[PDB]
Amino acid sequence: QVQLQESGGGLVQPGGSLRLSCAASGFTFDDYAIGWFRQAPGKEREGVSCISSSDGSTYYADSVKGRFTISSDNAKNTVYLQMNSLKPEDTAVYYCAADEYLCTGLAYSDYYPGKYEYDYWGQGTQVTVSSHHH
Amino acid sequence: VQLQESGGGLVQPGGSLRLSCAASGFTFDDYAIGWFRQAPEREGVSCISSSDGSTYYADSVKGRFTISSDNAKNTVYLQMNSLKPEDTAVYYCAADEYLCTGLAYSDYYPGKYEYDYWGQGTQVTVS
Amino acid sequence: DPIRRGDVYLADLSPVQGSEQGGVRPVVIIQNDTGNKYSPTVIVAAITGRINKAKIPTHVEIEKKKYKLDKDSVILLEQIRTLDKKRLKEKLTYLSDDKMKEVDNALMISLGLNAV
Amino acid sequence: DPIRRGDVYLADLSPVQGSEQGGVRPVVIIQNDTGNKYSPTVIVAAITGRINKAKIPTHVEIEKKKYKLDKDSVILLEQIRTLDKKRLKEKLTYLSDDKMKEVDNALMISLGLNA
């Protein structure tokens, strides 16, 4: 029914950039907030960005402010995450999620410690930042 | 808007009285009416709210006084039984939209609020 | 017979607009008990069973069995309003003191009455 | 441009029943600023010019001279409700911090909070 299909991942050089997509399916796009979480091996799942349907208000976690940008195409029911100035600490699995409260909850998590379950989750796309080969 | 009271006078301790307050130039159901008293500070005694008929009584007259209303005669009565000499004071009837919730709030929060309509006062002496 | 803070009434909230909660649904009395006895209005918070677990610091969960609901529900301390008392239909139950403490806390966050 | 706690908006509170305040009238936003930014609703408290002096511990006065009001008014912290933002028409003014401390206080009295 409700499916969030992401994409755009891959290997990037530090300082490079990427653009992730989240395609939303079986719900009303303007009645749900869609955003991005991330999780690096072994470590914790943190919320990154979120965009509410009406008002277009955005949220950004502190560690990606000025560097990431979320946006939405209401025609394509698609959310974008443009990641600039990529650092290796950004290397993780990026999931988009959607919920009525996804945006106000993520903004509240900057002030109150919580652990709230949100409704709809994507599959995740790998984002690796490394200098590597060659 | 006029408040004409009556019923005051001299009584022996243990006796009873029935004070009246007559309302004139307002809508009886759009105003709350009650009784204040002042012995040589001004305290609110009782009050009766227009709709719901909820009553307020000061603690020092609970069980002893009784307030009521005759909506046809636009009249509030205050039946004071088991009268004590501490009850000796000038009793004023007043009317305001918030008088009853205001009298009850003053048991918990100190205030100093001016209410709209005041009567002339009737002396109640217990001796 | 008296309206008390913490009481769970079934009350008619409609009509509403947009994201406001309407219908006939459980609500909780959040006004102080002096206003509940003497004022012509009460202040309530809405309960929805559209979610059964909380997602917001201003949300408080209510067990369906303990507090006589059809479904596991949540108090939306962001969905509050003043009702003429004639809007109160039925009194279903009343919250435990510990549930009113979670409600107090959520109301302080929702209304910006602490730090954050 | 963003909705802030202490902002005074013109809002449509109609229709209502009985003792609820309605009409298109000034209200003060009392919901927190995290909630005012992301949620689709705000929590407001109604303002009346039917009285100019306070009569209840949950009443707070607003002076026509300081704020863009038509009359000396009073905030009724017992008449509060959650409004969809589309109900807000115009931003009129915003209250001082000192005036908002009185708002907080009456809100704790109105809502049965002591902390």
Return the domain boundaries, chain B: 3-109
**Sequence-distant (≥ 6) Cβ neighbours of residue C98 within 8 angstroms:** none
Phi-psi region of D52 (alpha: psi -120 to 50; beta: other; left: phi over 0): alpha
Topology of the domain comprising A4-129: Immunoglobulin-like (2.60.40)
Q: Enter the tokens of residue C89.
A: 């239909």
The partner residues of C47 in beta bridges, in order of sequence, read: C75
CA distance B10 to C37: 35
**Other Cβ atoms closer than 10 A to D68:** 11
Question: Which residues on A lie below 8 Å from D85 (Cβ)?
Answer: 55
Mutate to test the interface with D, among C31, C81, C82, C95 (most CBs of D within 10 A): C82
**Cβ distance of D55 and B109 shorter than 8 Å:** no
**Sequence-distant (≥ 6) Cβ neighbours of residue A102 within 8 angstroms:** A32, A33, A34, A35, A50, A118
User: Which chains contact D through at least 3 pairs of Cβ atoms less than 8 Å apart?
Assistant: A, B, C
Give A56 to chain D, closest Cα distance, Å: 9
Which among D21, D33, D112 is the nearest to C112, CB-wise?
D33
Give the number of residues written for chain B: 127
Mutate to test the interface with C, among A59, A116, A118 (most CBs of C within 10 A): A116
Taking CA–CA distances from B109, the nearest residue in chain D reads D57
Count C/D contacts: CB-CB distance under 8 Å. 106
Pairing mode of beta strands B89-96, B117-118: antiparallel
Taking CA–CA distances from B53, the nearest residue in chain C reads C38
DSSP annotation of B28: G
Does D have 3 or more CB contacts under 8 Å with A?
yes
Q: Is C55 on the interface with D (CB under 8 A)?
A: no
**Cβ distance of C111 and D33 shorter than 8 Å:** no
Q: Enter the tokens of residue A44.
A: 């914790």
Contact B6, B122 (CB under 8 A): yes
CA distance A52 to A35: 9
Q: Is C109 on the interface with D (CB under 8 A)?
A: yes
Phi and psi for C110 in degrees, rounded to 5?
-60, -30
b/e sequence A2-24, b meaning 16+ C-beta within 10 Å: eebebebbeebeeeeebebbbbb
**Cβ distance of D54 and B113 shorter than 8 Å:** yes
Residues belonging to chain A with any Cβ–Cβ distance to chain D shorter than 8 Å: 52, 54-55, 57, 59, 103-104, 107-108, 111
Residues belonging to chain D with any Cβ–Cβ distance to chain A shorter than 8 Å: 34-35, 37-40, 85
**Sequence-distant (≥ 6) Cβ neighbours of residue B19 within 8 angstroms:** B5, B6, B7, B8, B35, B77, B78, B80, B91, B93, B122, B124
Contact A22, A49 (CB under 8 A): no
**Cβ distance of A101 and C57 shorter than 8 Å:** no
- Pick from A1, A4, A3: nearest CA to A81: A4
**Other Cβ atoms closer than 10 A to D98:** 7
The partner residues of B85 in beta bridges, in order of sequence, read: none
Phi-psi region of B52 (alpha: psi -120 to 50; beta: other; left: phi over 0): left
Contact D19, C84 (CB under 8 A): yes
Number of helices (H) and strands (E), helices first, in chain D? 2, 6
Give chain D's domains with CATH numbers: 2-115 (2.30.30.110)
Give C35 to chain B, closest Cα distance, Å: 7
Q: Is A110 helix (H, G, I), strand (E, B) or coil?
A: coil
Give A106 to chain C, closest Cα distance, Å: 9
Question: Which residues on B lie below 8 Å from C39 (Cβ)?
Answer: 101
- Residue C68: burial class (beta carbons within 10 Å; 0-12, 13-18, 19+): middle
Give D13 to chain B, closest Cα distance, Å: 22
Tokens 């159901």 map to which residue? B29
DSSP annotation of B109: S
Alpha-carbon distance values, D84 to A7, C14, C114, D2, D96 (Å): 35, 14, 24, 15, 25
Q: What DSSP string runs through C62-109?
A: E-TTTTT-SS-EEEEEEEEEEEEGGGEEEEEEE--HHHHHHHHHHHHH
CA distance B86 to B90: 12
Q: Which CATH superfamily is domain B3-109 in?
A: Immunoglobulins (2.60.40.10)
Give the number of residues written for chain A: 134
Q: Please report, as a single letter, which amino acid is at residue B72.
A: A
Q: Please measure the distance between the N-terminal and C-terminal CA atoms of chain A and give it in whole angstroms.
A: 45
Question: Which residues on D lie below 8 Å from C113 (Cβ)?
Answer: 104, 107-108, 113, 115
Q: What DSSP string runs through C4-18?
A: -TTEEEEEE--S--T
Taking CA–CA distances from A106, the nearest residue in chain C reads C56
Mutate to test the interface with B, among D21, D48, D52, D55 (most CBs of B within 10 A): D55
**Cβ distance of A112 and C57 shorter than 8 Å:** yes
DSSP annotation of A106: H
**Sequence-distant (≥ 6) Cβ neighbours of residue D103 within 8 angstroms:** D6, D28, D30, D45, D60, D75, D77, D95
Taking the mean position of all CA atoms in its chain, how far away is CA B79?
10
- Residue C62: burial class (beta carbons within 10 Å; 0-12, 13-18, 19+): buried
Q: What is the dihedral of CA A41, A46, A52, A53, to 10 degrees?
A: 20
The vertex-B90 CA angle with B84 and B94, nearest 5°, equals 115
- Pick from A132, A89, A129, A125: nearest CA to A8: A125
CA distance B85 to D74: 41
Alpha-carbon distance values, C90 to A97, B34, C23, C81, D20 (Å): 39, 31, 14, 17, 20
Q: Enter the tokens of residue D88.
A: 């807000």
- Name the experimental technique: X-ray
Specified resolution (Å): 2.7
Bond prior to D26 in cis (omega within 30° of 0): no
**Cβ distance of D40 and A103 shorter than 8 Å:** no
CA distance C79 to D42: 9
Contact B79, B65 (CB under 8 A): yes
Contact C17, C2 (CB under 8 A): no
**Sequence-distant (≥ 6) Cβ neighbours of residue C115 within 8 angstroms:** none
Q: Enter the tokens of residue B63.
A: 């069980």
CA distance B23 to B87: 24
**Cβ distance of A107 and D37 shorter than 8 Å:** yes
Residue A93 C-beta-side C-alpha neighbours within 13 Å? 12
Q: Enter the tokens of residue B120.
A: 């002339």
Residues belonging to chain A with any Cβ–Cβ distance to chain C shorter than 8 Å: 99-101, 104-105, 108, 111-112, 114, 116-118
